[PDB]
């Protein structure tokens, strides 16, 4: 995983991925979000899924939340309060141990960052007014700092892997939705059906009519749907209204 001061960003589109398997697992120590409950994650459909991944120190996992301050929350990553997503953080003690020092983060910056900004730079920040360039000196400071992720550290010092998921509420035509449930089929019974949006009531029978390879459901007159093919089997069926009198 990439370091926090250069957070890894990825875009996911045109897929249907179940979100239940995430919070149903046990490895994910922290599964935090308020914009949507875990139950209705798969129920809703979203657009422009973005994933941000990095590795940080444990004791500051709280700092990744809408509207918080701190070195990581101001100079390495920014989280707007109007955030529509979720956060998944889990321990990686046995995956990032020795200690190891190849990690870096931003320590000094002019000011805060705009939401989802990527803060990449390398300058000798000066704690005074004298201009120093080329080499560090008095009141000249190095912008970055490393992490001592020793394998024998306690809680709060072990490295934690953090993934933040963001999205938009279908501001464009739908791209990524949740999984859709399916059931079996019955015949010669008065049943109400919901075939991929087309809802109705009646009795289902087998048919000998022939469709072209691209239609989905036929009819006869006066908006009376009569024949529908099941998407799973591509087999044409017949609808007949249930008896009354």
């Amino acid at each position: 995983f990439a370091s926090v001061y250069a957070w890894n960003r990825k875009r996911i589109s045109n897929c249907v991925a179940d979100y239940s398997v995430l919070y149903n697992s046990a490895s994910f120590s922290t599964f935090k979000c308020y914009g949507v409950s875990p139950t209705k994650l798969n129920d809703l459909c979203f657009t422009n899924v973005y994933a941000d991944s990095f590795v940080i120190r444990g004791d500051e996992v709280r700092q990744i939340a809408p509207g918080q301050t701190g070195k990581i929350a101001d100079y390495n990553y920014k989280l707007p309060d109007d955030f529509t997503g979720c956060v998944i953080a889990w321990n990686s003690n046995n995956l990032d141990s020795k200690g190891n020092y190849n990690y870096l983060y931003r320590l000094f910056r002019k000011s805060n960052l705009k939401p989802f900004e990527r803060d990449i730079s390398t300058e000798i920040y000066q704690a005074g007014s004298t201009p120093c360039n080329g080499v560090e000196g008095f009141n000249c400071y190095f912008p970055l700092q490393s992490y001592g992720f020793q394998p024998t550290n306690g809680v709060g010092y072990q490295p934690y892997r953090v993934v933040v998921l963001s999205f938009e509420l279908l501001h464009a035509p739908a791209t990524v939705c949740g999984p859709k449930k399916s059931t079996n089929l019955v015949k010669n019974k008065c049943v109400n059906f919901n075939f991929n949006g087309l809802t109705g009531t009646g009795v289902l029978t087998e048919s000998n009519k022939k469709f072209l390879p691209f239609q989905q459901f036929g009819r006869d007159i006066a908006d009376t749907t009569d024949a529908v093919r099941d998407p799973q089997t591509l087999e044409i069926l017949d609808i007949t209204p249930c008896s009354f009198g």
Epitope: D59, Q145, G148, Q150, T152, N153, G154, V155, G156, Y157
Partner: antibody, heavy 118, light 109 residues
Framework: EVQLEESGGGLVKPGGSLKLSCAAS????????MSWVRQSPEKRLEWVAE????????NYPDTATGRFTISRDNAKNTLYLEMSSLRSEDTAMYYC???????????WGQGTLVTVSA | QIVLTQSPAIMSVSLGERVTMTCTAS???????LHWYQQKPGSSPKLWIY???NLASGVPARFSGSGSGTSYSLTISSMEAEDAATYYC?????????FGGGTKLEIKR
Amino acid sequence: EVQLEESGGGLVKPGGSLKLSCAASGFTFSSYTMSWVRQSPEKRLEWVAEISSGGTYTNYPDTATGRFTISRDNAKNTLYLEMSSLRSEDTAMYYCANFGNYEEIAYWGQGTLVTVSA
Amino acid sequence: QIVLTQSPAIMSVSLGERVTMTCTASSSVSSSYLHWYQQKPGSSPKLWIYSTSNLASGVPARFSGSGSGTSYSLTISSMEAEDAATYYCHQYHRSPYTFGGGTKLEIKR
């Protein structure tokens, strides 16, 4: 809590071995890494050796590579520490404290005078 | 490992004024790993300034200081009677954990 009470010390012989037991109770010992530090009379503090309660891991400085042993027991909550063939230069006073654990490092031990005699 | 060196050995500084103390090291240790204890005579040390900027419990917001890199500075506001104590620099980045050289803070009449 009772602040990491340590086993009592006393005068020993240059060639024996004294055991320090930092048994305590008051907070979880399955995730808190212990540590042992010593101070000679009017001399800089020096970290002796720590143990990791997460996996009961042993690692400690190279000033004395093979003469320090630590055993942890979360059952009765005891921290056993000894050295092999102590010399007359090893007289000091020892603390058992909390290193590596949660950020708010605190709860230094009451101390115990581990002195040698001739 | 990196040894912690204190530039002043002892401060025979009178009451009232405001001075600074320095912790020097051969290389940069961390932005926030170091800390300072206070070993009272015949007692156990207690930490006040942690993370190189933050303050622990019991600090009257009098003890302060800032720095980064190979040298760090700790500042005061005004000396009083309870400042006659001991200070110790610390480092936790590298595997061998060391302590500061120590300063025997004392007041002068």
